[PDB]
Coordinates of C-alpha atoms and ligand atoms in Angstrom, one line a residue:
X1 CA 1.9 -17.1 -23.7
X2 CA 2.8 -19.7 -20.7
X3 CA 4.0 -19.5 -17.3
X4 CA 5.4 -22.6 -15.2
X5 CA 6.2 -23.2 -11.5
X6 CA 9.6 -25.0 -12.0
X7 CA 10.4 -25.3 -8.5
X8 CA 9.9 -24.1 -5.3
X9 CA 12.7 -23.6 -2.8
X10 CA 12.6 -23.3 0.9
X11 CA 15.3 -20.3 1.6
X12 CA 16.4 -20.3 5.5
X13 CA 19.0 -17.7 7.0
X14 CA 22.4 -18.1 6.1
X15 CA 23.2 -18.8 9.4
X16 CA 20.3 -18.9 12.2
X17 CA 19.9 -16.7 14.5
X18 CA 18.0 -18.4 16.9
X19 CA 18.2 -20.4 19.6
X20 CA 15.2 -21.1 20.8
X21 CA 11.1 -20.4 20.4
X22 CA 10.8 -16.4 19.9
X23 CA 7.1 -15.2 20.0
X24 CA 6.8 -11.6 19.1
X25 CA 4.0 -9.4 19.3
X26 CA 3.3 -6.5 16.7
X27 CA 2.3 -3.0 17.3
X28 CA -1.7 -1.6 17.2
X29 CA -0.8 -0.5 14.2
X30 CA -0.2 -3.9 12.9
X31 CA -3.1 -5.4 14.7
X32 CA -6.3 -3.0 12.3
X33 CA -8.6 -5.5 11.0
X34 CA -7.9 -3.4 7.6
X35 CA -4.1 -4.7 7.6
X36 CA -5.3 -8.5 7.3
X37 CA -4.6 -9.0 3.7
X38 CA -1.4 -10.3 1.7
X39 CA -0.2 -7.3 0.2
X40 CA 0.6 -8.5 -3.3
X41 CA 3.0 -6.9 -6.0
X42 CA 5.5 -6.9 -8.9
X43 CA 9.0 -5.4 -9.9
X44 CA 10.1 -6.3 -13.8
X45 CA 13.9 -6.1 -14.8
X46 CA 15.6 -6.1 -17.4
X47 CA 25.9 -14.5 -15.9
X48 CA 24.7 -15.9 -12.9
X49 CA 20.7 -16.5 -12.7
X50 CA 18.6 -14.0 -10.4
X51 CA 17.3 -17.1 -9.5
X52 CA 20.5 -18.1 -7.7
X53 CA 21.5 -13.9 -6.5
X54 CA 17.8 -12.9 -5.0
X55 CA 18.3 -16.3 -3.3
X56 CA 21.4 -16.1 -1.4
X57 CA 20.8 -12.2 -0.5
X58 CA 17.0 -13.4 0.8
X59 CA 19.5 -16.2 2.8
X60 CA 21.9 -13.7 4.6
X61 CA 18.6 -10.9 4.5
X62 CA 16.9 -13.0 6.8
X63 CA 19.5 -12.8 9.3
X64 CA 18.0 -9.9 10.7
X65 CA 14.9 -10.4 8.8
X66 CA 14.1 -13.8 10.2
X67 CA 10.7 -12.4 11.1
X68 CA 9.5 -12.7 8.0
X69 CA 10.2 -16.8 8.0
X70 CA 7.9 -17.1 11.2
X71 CA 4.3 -18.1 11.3
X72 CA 1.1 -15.6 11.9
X73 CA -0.9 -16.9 15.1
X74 CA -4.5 -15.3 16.4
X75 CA -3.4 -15.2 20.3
X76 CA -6.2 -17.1 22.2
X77 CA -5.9 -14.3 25.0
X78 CA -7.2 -11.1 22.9
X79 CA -7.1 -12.6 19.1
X80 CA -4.3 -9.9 18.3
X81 CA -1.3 -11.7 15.9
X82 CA 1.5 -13.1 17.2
X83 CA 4.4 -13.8 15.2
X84 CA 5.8 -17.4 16.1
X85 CA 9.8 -17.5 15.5
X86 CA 12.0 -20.5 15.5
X87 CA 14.9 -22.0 14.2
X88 CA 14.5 -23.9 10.8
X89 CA 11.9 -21.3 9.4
X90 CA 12.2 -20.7 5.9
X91 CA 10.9 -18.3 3.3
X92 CA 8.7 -19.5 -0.1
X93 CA 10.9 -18.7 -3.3
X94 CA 8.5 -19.4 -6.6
X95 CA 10.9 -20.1 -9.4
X96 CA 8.6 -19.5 -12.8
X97 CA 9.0 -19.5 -16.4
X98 CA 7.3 -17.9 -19.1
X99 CA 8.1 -18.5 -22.8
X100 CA 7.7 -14.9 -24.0
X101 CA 10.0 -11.7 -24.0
X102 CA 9.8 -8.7 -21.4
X103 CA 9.8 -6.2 -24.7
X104 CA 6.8 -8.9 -26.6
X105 CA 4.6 -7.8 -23.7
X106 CA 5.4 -4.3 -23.4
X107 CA 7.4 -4.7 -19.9
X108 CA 3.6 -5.2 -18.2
X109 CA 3.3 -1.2 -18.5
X110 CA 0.2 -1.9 -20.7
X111 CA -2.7 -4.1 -20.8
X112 CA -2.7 -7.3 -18.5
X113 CA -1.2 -10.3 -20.8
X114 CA -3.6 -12.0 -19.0
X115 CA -0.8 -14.1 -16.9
X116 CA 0.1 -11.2 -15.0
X117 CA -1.9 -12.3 -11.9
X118 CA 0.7 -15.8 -11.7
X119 CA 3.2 -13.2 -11.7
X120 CA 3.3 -13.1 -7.5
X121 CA 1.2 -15.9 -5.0
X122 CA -2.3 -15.5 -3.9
X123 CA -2.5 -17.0 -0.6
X124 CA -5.9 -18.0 1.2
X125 CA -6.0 -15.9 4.4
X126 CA -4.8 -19.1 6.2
X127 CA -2.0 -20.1 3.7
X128 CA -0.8 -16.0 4.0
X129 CA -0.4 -16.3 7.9
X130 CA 1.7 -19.7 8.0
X131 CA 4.1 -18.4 5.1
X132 CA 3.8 -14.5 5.5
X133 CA 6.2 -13.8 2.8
X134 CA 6.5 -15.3 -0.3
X135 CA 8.8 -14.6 -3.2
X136 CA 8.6 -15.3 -6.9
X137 CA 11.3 -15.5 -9.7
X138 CA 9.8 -15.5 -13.1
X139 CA 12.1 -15.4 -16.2
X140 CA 11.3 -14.8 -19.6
X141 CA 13.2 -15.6 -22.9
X142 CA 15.4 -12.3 -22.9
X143 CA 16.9 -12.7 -19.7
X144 CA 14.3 -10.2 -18.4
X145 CA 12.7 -11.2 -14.7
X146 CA 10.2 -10.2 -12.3
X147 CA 10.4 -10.1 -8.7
X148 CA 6.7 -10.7 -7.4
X149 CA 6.0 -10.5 -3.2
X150 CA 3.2 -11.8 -1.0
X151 CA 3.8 -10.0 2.1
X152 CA 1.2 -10.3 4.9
X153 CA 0.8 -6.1 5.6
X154 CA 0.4 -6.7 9.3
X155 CA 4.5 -7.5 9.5
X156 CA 5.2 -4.7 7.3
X157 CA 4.3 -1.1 5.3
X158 CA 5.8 -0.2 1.8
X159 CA 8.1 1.6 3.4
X160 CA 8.9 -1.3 6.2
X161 CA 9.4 -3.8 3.3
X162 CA 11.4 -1.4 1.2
X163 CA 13.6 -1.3 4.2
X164 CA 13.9 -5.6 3.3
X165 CA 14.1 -5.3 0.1
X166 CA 17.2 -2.7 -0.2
X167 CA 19.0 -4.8 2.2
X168 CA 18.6 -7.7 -0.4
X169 CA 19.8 -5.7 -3.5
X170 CA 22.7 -4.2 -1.6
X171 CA 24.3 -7.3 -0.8
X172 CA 23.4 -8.8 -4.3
X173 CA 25.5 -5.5 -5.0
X174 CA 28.1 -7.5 -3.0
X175 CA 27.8 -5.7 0.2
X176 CA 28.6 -8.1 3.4
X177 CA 26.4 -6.7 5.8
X178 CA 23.3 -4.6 5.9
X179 CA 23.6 -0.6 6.1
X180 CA 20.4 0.1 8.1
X181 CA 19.8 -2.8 11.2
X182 CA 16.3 -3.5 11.4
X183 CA 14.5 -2.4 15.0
X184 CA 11.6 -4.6 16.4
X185 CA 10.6 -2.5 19.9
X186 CA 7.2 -2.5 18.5
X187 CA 4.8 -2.6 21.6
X188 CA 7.0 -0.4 23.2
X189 CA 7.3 2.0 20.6
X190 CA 3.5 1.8 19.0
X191 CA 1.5 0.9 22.3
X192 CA -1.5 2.6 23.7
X193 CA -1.5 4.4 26.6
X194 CA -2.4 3.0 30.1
X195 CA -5.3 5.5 30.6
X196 CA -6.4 5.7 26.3
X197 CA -7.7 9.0 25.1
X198 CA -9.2 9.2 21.5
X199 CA -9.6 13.0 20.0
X200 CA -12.5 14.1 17.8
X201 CA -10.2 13.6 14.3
X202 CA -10.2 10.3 14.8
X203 CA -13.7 9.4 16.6
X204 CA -15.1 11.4 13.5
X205 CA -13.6 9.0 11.0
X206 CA -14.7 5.9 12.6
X207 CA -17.3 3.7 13.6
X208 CA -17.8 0.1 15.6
X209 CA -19.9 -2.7 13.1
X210 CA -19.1 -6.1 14.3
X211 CA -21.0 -7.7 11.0
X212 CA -19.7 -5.1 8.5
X213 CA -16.5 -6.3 5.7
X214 CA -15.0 -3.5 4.0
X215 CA -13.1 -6.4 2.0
X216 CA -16.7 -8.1 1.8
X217 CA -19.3 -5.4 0.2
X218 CA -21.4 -6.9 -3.0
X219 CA -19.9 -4.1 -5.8
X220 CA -19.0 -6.7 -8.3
X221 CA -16.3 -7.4 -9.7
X222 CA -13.3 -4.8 -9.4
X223 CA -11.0 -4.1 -12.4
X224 CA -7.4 -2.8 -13.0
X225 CA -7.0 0.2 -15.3
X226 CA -3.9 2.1 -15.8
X227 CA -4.1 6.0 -16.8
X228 CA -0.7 7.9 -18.1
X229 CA -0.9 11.4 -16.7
X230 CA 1.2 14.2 -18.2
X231 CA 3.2 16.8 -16.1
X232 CA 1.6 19.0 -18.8
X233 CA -1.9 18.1 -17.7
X234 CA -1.3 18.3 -14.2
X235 CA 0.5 22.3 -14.5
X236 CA -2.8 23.2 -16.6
X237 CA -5.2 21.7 -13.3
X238 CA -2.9 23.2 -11.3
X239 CA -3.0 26.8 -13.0
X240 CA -6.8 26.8 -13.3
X241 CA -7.5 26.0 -9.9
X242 CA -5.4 28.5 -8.5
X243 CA -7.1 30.5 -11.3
X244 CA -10.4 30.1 -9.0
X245 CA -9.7 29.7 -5.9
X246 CA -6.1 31.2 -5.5
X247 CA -4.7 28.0 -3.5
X248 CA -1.6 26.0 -5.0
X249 CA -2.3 22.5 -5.2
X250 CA -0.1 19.2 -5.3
X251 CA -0.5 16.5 -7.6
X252 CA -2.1 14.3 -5.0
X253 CA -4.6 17.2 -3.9
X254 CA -5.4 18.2 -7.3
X255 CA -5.4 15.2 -9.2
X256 CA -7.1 13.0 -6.4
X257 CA -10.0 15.9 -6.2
X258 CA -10.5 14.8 -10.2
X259 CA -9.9 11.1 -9.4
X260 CA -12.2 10.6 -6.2
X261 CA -15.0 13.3 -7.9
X262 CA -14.8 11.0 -11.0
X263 CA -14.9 7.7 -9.0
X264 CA -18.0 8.6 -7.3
X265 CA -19.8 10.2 -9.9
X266 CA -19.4 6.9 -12.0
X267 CA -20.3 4.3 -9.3
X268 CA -23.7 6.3 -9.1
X269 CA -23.4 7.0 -5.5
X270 CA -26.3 8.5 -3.6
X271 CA -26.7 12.1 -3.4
X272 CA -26.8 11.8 0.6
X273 CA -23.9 8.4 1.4
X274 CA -21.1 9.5 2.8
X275 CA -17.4 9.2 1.1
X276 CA -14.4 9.2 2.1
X277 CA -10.7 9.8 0.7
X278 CA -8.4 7.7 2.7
X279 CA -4.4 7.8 2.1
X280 CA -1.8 6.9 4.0
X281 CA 0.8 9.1 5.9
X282 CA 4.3 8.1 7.0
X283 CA 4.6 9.3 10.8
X284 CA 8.2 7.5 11.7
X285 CA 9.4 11.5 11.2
X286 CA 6.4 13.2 13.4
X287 CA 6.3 11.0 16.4
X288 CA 7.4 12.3 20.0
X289 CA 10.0 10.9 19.9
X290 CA 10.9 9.9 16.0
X291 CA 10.7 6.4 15.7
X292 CA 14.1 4.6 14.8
X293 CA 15.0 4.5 11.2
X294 CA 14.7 0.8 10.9
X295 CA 11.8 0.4 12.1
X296 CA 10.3 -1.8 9.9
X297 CA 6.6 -2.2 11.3
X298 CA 3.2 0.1 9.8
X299 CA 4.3 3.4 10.9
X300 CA 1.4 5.0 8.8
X301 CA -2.0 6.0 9.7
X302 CA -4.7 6.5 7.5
X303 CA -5.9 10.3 7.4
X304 CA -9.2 11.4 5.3
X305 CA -11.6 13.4 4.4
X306 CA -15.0 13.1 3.8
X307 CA -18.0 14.9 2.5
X308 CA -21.8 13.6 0.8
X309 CA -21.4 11.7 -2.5
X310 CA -24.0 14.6 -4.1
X311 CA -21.6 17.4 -2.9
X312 CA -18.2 16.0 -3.7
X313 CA -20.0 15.1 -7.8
X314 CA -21.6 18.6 -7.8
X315 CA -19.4 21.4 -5.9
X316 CA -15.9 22.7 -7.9
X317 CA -12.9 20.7 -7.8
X318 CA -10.9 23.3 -6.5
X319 CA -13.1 23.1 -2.9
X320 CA -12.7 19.3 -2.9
X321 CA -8.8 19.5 -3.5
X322 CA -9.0 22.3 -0.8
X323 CA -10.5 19.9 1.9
X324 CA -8.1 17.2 0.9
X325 CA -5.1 19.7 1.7
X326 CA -7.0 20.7 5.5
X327 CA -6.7 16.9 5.9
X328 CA -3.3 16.9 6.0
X329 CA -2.9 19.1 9.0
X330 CA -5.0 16.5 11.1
X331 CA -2.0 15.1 11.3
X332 CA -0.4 15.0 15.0
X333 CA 1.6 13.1 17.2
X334 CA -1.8 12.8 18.8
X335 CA -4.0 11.7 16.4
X336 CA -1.6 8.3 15.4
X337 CA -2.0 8.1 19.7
X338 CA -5.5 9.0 19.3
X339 CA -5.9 6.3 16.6
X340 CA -3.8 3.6 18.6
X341 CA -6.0 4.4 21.7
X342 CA -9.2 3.2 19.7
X343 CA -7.7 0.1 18.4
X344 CA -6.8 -0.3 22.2
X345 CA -10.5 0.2 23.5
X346 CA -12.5 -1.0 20.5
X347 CA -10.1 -3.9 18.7
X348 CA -12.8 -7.4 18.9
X349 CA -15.5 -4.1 18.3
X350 CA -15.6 -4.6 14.5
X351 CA -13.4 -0.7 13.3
X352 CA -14.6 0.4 10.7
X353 CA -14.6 3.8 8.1
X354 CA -18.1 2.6 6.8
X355 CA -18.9 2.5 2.8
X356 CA -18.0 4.8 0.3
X357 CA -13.9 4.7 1.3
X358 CA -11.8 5.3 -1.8
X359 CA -8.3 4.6 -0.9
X360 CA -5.3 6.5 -2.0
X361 CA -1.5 5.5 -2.1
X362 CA 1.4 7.5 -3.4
X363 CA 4.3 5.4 -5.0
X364 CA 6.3 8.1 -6.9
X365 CA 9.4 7.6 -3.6
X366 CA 9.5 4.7 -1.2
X367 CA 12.6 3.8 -2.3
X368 CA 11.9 1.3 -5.7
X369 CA 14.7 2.3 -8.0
X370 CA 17.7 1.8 -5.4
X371 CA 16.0 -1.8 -5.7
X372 CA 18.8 -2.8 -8.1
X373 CA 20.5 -7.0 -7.7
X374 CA 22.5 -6.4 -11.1
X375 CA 20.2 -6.2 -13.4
X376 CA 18.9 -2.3 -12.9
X377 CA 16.6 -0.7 -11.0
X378 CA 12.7 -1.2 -11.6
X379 CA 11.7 -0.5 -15.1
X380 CA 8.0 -1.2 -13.7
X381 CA 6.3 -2.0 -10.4
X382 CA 2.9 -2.8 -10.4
X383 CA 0.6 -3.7 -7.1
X384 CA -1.8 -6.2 -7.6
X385 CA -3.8 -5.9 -4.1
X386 CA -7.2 -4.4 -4.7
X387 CA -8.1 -4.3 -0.8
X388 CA -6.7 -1.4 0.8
X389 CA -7.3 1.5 4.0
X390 CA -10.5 -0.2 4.3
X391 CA -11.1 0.2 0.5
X392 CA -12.1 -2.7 -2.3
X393 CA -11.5 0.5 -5.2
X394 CA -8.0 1.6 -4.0
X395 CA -5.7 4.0 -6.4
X396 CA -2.2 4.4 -7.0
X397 CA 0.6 7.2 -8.1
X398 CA 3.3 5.2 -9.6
X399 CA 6.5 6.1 -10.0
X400 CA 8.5 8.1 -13.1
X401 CA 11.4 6.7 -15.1
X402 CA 7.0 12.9 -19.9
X403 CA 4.4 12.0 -16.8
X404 CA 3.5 9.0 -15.0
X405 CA 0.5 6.1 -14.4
X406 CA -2.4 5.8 -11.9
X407 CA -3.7 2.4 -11.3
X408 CA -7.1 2.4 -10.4
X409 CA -9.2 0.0 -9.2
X410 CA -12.7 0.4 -9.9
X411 CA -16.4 -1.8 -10.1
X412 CA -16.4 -3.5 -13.7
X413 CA -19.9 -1.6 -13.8
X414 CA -18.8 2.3 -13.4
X415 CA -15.2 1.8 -15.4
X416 CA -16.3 3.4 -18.6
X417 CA -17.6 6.0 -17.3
X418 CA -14.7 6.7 -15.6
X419 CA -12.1 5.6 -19.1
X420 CA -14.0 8.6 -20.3
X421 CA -13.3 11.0 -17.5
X422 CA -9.6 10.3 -17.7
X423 CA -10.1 10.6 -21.6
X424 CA -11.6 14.2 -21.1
X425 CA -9.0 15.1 -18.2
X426 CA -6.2 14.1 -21.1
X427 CA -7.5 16.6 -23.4
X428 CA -8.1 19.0 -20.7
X429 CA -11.3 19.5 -20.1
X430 CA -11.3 19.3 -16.6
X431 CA -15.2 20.3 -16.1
X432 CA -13.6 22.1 -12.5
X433 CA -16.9 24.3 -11.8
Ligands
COA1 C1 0.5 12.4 2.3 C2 1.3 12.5 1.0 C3 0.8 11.5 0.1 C4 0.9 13.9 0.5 O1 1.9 14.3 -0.5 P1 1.7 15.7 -1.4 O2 0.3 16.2 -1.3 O3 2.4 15.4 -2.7 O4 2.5 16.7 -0.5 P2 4.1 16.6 -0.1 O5 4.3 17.9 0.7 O6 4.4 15.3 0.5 O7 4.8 16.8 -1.5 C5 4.9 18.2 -1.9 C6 5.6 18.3 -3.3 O8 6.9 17.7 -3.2 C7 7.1 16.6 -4.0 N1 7.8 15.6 -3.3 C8 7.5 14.9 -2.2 N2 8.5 14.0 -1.9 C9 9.4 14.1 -2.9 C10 10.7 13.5 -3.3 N3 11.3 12.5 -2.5 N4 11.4 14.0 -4.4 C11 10.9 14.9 -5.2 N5 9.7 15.5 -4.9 C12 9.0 15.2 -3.8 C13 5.7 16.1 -4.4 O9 5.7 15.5 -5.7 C14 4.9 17.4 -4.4 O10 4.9 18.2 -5.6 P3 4.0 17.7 -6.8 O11 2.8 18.7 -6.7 O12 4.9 17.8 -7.9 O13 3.6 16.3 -6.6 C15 2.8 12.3 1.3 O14 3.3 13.5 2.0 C16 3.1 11.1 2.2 O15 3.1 11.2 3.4 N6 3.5 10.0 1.6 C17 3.9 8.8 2.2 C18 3.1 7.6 1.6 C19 3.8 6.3 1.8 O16 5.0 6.2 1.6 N7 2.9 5.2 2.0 C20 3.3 3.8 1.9 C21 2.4 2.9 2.8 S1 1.9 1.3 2.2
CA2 CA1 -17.4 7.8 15.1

């Protein structure tokens, strides 16, 4: 089972909307050491090629998304990015083959084929700053396709690149120009203040380590693993924990509790490390003011909570779920300022949330089924990054179209452990005292 780079094509606006030399700056929230990675991931579908339609809509996209086409510079002033713009700029398109069927392989929902990682590009830190976005059209011998993306996270969130990527789909859907108009404003809008202020929430989460790599810590190698969770699993957790503690718990509380307790336990942390559960809230809705609906840039912040290894593997589940939910009331128009204001004061000072961070992303929305350039919506996506809100073992909810996958990524050495913890939580026993 073989996959070929056919071509590559170099995809420029369809007409350009620049002048002259444009160098933009991106917000704080852009500029955390922890965003400096090419986000990497995969949608799979289901006559003209999609070759020649995601093509031309990338072409008339980039437009307004021209940003995209530009170069990645440190700035020799502060070594924040910069985001060089001019006329001529192109994006990557990867045009790909592979001489097998969508439905011979399971649509990628299972085990890796073991080409999956050609799927999208890899670039080299340097390679993912001059060409910041990268695109790949693989087709296989049904007529089936995958859309793989490089996207360099400081330009972009999920939610930011969803914003691209709907634009693309609607005018494949023959739409002429874009419903949403993408906003840029992003010093202005995500800037510190001129006198910064950091609260407590966020002072208590970090830490300045010049030397220390999140991306960099000697855990060994990191696998993929995929676990189908039933809704009927989930509303049996759910019933026992408010059983014993009388709290309702979401999903992500209740399940990440289990997850993160399961994680830890099986990686043989220390009684006395500290760890953390890191996710990642959209705050477009609860600044003051909102930010603008096309606001493409990060407008998330990671929240946590954290707790010693030895407590999190030995107290219930229904305590750790509990301090998961208090974490979500951190949240604050203040604390994103608070957490700008330390990027402001402490940027070339090394941030850091320290060892022990399991990262936690929730994929079930953001937008993937509207995703649709003639062929359907999504019939799987499946991120391929393993470095994450300063984790190297990041987890994911997936989306639905009875239950749904998380995609854990975990240290080769603790993963049965853990196979056999999701194996038990399948069968329900849940082990919650
Ligand atoms: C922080 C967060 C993960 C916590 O979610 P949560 O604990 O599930 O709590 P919420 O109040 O958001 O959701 C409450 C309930 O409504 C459901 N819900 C949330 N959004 C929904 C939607 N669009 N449609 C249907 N149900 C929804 C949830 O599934 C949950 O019920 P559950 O127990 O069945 O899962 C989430 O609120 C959030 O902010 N997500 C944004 C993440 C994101 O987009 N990141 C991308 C960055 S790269
Ligand atoms: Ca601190």
């Amino acid at each position: 089972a073989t996959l070929e780079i056919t071509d590559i094509a170099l995809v420029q606006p369809s007409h350009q909307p620049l002048s002259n030399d444009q160098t933009l700056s991106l917000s704080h929230l852009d500029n955390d050491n922890n965003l400096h990675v090419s986000f990497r991931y995969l949608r799979v579908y289901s006559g003209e090629s999609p070759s020649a339609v995601v093509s031309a809509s990338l072409a008339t996209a980039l437009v307004h998304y021209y940003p995209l086409a530009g170069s990645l510079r440190r700035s020799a002033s502060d070594n924040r990015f910069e985001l060089l713009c001019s006329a001529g700029q192109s994006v990557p398109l990867v045009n790909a083959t592979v001489n097998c069927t969508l439905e011979s392989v399971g649509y990628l929902d299972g085990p890796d084929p073991g080409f999956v990682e050609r799927l999208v590009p890899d670039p080299t830190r340097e390679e993912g700053m001059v060409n910041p976005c990268i695109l790949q059209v693989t087709m296989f011998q049904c007529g089936g396709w995958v859309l793989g993306a490089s996207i360099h996270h400081a330009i972009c969130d999920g939610l930011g690149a969803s914003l691209f990527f709907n634009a693309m789909a609607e005018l494949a859907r023959g739409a002429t120009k874009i419903s949403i108009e993408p906003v840029w404003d992003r010093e202005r809008l995500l800037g510190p203040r001129e006198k910064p202020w950091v609260g407590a929430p966020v002072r208590d989460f970090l830490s300045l380590d010049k030397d220390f790599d999140p991306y960099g810590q000697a855990i060994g190698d990191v696998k993929r693993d995929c676990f189908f969770v039933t809704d009927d699993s989930l509303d049996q957790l759910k019933a026992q924990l408010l059983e014993k503690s009388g709290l309702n718990f979401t999903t992500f509380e209740a399940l990440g509790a289990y997850i993160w307790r399961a994680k830890v336990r099986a990686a043989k942390t220390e009684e006395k490390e500290n760890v953390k559960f890191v996710y990642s809230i959209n705050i477009r809705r609860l600044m003051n003011p909102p930010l603008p609906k096309g606001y493409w840039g990060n407008g998330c912040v990671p929240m946590y909570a954290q707790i010693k290894a030895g407590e999190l593997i030995e107290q219930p589940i229904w305590k750790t779920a509990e301090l998961i939910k208090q974490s979500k009331s951190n949240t604050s128009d203040e604390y994103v300022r608070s957490f700008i204001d330390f990027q402001e004061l402490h940027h070339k000072d090394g941030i850091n949330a320290g060892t022990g961070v399991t990262g936690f992303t929730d994929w079930r929305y953001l937008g993937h089924s509207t995703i649709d350039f003639g062929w359907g919506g999504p019939v799987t996506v499946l991120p391929l990054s393993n470095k994450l809100l300063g984790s190297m073992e990041p987890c994911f909810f997936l989306p639905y179209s009875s239950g749904f996958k998380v995609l854990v990524n975990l240290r080769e050495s603790a993963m049965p452990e853990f196979k056999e913890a999701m194996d038990k939580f399948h069968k329900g026993e849940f082990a919650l005292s």
